[PDB]
Every structure is written in structure tokens, then in C-alpha cells.
């Protein structure tokens, strides 16, 4: 009969709520990816910083032993 | 007709089933996110503060 | 007609989407917290470094 | 009389079911492009936390390395 009628509104009503629910997810992803800039900005900053110390941890070596 | 509404509307309530899901694992990988942004923001204050030590440790090695 | 055969298709394909972004989410969630504990790690030996770092600094400019 | 007007009805809830499927069927295809673009944007962000999780490994080459050259710092400093 029309439950048949009301069935379809059903379906294309639940098929708006997946499309919310992807966008949703879409946008949740796509916001995370600035936490992903500061995590990747954090460690490139330490791999950095790590380096240029142990390029002076070699210039104080060499210093200690020119030191007689 | 009909049933190929009910055959293929919890078709979709499945995907919505899936989704809900899938939102609640982003929310779990936004909060791991959040600890990695923490943790790797200490070992950049760390890494620099190295970095000064080690300036410091030549200076005093010369010297 | 019958274009619920075209609606079926198309939500399948989102029943598709669907979990292979639950399998990839689950798959980071584990990638993510083994750098979460790579971090942790790096931070441990960093740590070592510089207690090295200030005992060499006490060593010899303090003696 | 009115007989003919229940068939109107009938069949005009015919013709928007028809455009009830075919809007569903839209949103379907549209939801298609962004849960497509979500598994971009994954592979796109694993690559990121790989990179990162490499970037790490380096720093703790470096790590490594300035251990090294600290235990020979503290080596020399006992003379």
C-alpha cells in the first residue's frame, strides 16, 4: 500500500543522514590533519635541534682534547 | 513491491552503522593525535634545550 | 520503475567506502600509537643524553 | 464522481516517490566523492605519520651519536 510510500521517505531520509555522516567524517579527518602539522613540525624541529648538538657536542669534544 | 526498500534500506542502516563506528574511531585517533602533538611538542622543547646545552658545553670546552 | 536497483548499487559502493575507512582508521590507530611509543622513546633517550651532557659539564668545569 | 480523483492522487504519489529515488539516489552518488576523498585524505595523513615516525628515527641516530661522543667527553675528562 502507501507503506511503500512512507518506506521510500524512510530510505531517502536515512540516505541524507549517510551523506551527513560521511561530510562529518570528511570534516573531522581534514581538521585532525593540523594536528598532524604540529606533531610533524614538532619532530622535524627535534631532528633538527638533536642534529645541530651533536655537531657541537663534536666541536666541545675536539676542544676538550686540544685543551693538552 | 516493496521489500527492495526493506532489502536495501537497512542496506543502508548498515553503512550508517559502519559510519557511526568509523566517527568513533576518528575521535579516539583525535585524541591520540592531541598526546602525539603534546609528547613530540616536549621533545622540541627538549631537543632545543639540548641544542643550547651542547652550544654551551663548547663554550665551556674552550675556554 | 526500479531505479531502487541504481540506489542499491550506489549505497553498496558506500557500505564499500565505508569499511575500508574503518580498516585504514584501525590500521593508523596501531601505527599511531607506535609512534606514540617511539615518542615516548626518543624523549627516554634524550633525557639520558643530556643527564650525560650535565655530568660532563660538572666533569671538567667544576674540577 | 470523485473516483477518477483517487486515481490522481494515486498516481501523483506515484511520481514524486519516483522523485524521492531518484534525489536519494543523487546523494548516494555525491556521498561517493567525499567518502573517496576521506580515503585520499587517510593515505595522505599515513604518509605524513610514516614520514614523521621515519623523521624520529633519525633523530634518534643523532641520539645515538651524541651519546657516543658525550661517553668520550667523559672518558677524557677522568684524563
Same mark, same amino acid.
Given at each position: 500500500?502507501?507503506?511503500?510510500?512512507?518506506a521510500?521517505?524512510?530510505? $531517502?531520509?536515512?540516505?541524507?543522514?549517510?551523506?551527513?555522516?560521511?561530510?562529518? %567524517?570528511?570534516?573531522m579527518i581534514?581538521? &585532525?590533519?593540523?594536528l598532524?602539522?604540529?606533531i610533524?613540525?614538532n619532530? $622535524?624541529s627535534?631532528?633538527?635541534?638533536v642534529?645541530?648538538?651533536?655537531?657541537? %657536542?663534536?666541536?666541545?669534544?675536539?676542544? &676538550?682534547?686540544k685543551?693538552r | 513491491?516493496?521489500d527492495?526498500?526493506?532489502?536495501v534500506?537497512?542496506?543502508?542502516?548498515?553503512?550508517?552503522?559502519?559510519?557511526?563506528?568509523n566517527?568513533?574511531?576518528?575521535?579516539?585517533?583525535?585524541?591520540?593525535?592531541?598526546?602525539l602533538?603534546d609528547?613530540?611538542?616536549?621533545?622540541?622543547?627538549?631537543?632545543?634545550?639540548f641544542?643550547?646545552?651542547?652550544?654551551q658545553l663548547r663554550?665551556?670546552?674552550?675556554? | 520503475?526500479?531505479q531502487?536497483?541504481?540506489?542499491?548499487?550506489?549505497?553498496?559502493?558506500?557500505?564499500?567506502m565505508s569499511?575500508?575507512?574503518?580498516?585504514e582508521?584501525?590500521?593508523?590507530?596501531?601505527?599511531?600509537?607506535?609512534?606514540?611509543?617511539?615518542?615516548?622513546?626518543?624523549?627516554?633517550?634524550?633525557?639520558?643524553?643530556?643527564?650525560?651532557?650535565?655530568?660532563?659539564?660538572?666533569?671538567?668545569?667544576?674540577? | 464522481?470523485?473516483?477518477?480523483?483517487?486515481?490522481?492522487?494515486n498516481?501523483?504519489?506515484?511520481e514524486?516517490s519516483?522523485r524521492?529515488?531518484?534525489?536519494?539516489?543523487?546523494?548516494?552518488?555525491?556521498?561517493?566523492?567525499?567518502?573517496?576523498?576521506?580515503?585520499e585524505?587517510?593515505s595522505h595523513?599515513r604518509?605524513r605519520i610514516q614520514?614523521?615516525?621515519?623523521?624520529?628515527?633519525?633523530?634518534?641516530?643523532?641520539?645515538?651519536?651524541?651519546?657516543?661522543?658525550?661517553?668520550?667527553?667523559?672518558?677524557?675528562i677522568?684524563?
Amino acid at each position: 500500500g502507501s507503506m511503500r510510500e512512507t518506506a521510500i521517505q524512510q530510505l $531517502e531520509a536515512d540516505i541524507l543522514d549517510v551523506n551527513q555522516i560521511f561530510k562529518d %567524517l570528511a570534516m573531522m579527518i581534514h581538521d &585532525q590533519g593540523d594536528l598532524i602539522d604540529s606533531i610533524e613540525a614538532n619532530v $622535524e624541529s627535534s631532528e633538527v635541534h638533536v642534529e645541530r648538538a651533536s655537531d657541537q %657536542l663534536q666541536r666541545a669534544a675536539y676542544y &676538550q682534547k686540544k685543551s693538552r | 513491491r516493496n521489500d527492495k526498500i526493506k532489502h536495501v534500506q537497512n542496506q543502508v542502516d548498515e553503512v550508517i552503522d559502519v559510519m557511526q563506528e568509523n566517527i568513533t574511531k576518528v575521535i579516539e585517533r583525535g585524541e591520540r593525535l592531541d598526546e602525539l602533538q603534546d609528547k613530540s611538542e616536549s621533545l622540541s622543547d627538549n631537543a632545543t634545550a639540548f641544542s643550547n646545552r651542547s652550544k654551551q658545553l663548547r663554550r665551556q670546552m674552550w675556554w | 520503475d526500479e531505479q531502487l536497483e541504481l540506489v542499491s548499487g550506489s549505497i553498496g559502493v558506500l557500505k564499500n567506502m565505508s569499511q575500508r575507512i574503518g580498516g585504514e582508521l584501525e590500521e593508523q590507530a596501531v601505527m599511531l600509537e607506535d609512534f606514540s611509543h617511539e615518542l615516548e622513546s626518543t624523549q627516554s633517550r634524550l633525557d639520558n643524553v643530556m643527564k650525560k651532557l650535565a655530568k660532563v659539564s660538572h666533569m671538567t668545569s667544576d674540577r | 464522481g470523485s473516483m477518477r480523483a483517487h486515481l490522481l492522487d494515486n498516481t501523483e504519489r506515484l511520481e514524486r516517490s519516483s522523485r524521492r529515488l531518484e534525489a536519494g539516489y543523487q546523494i548516494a552518488v555525491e556521498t561517493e566523492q567525499i567518502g573517496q576523498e576521506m580515503l585520499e585524505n587517510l593515505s595522505h595523513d599515513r604518509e605524513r605519520i610514516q614520514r614523521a615516525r621515519e623523521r624520529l628515527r633519525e633523530t634518534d641516530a643523532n641520539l645515538g651519536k651524541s651519546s657516543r661522543i658525550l661517553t668520550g667527553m667523559l672518558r677524557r675528562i677522568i684524563q
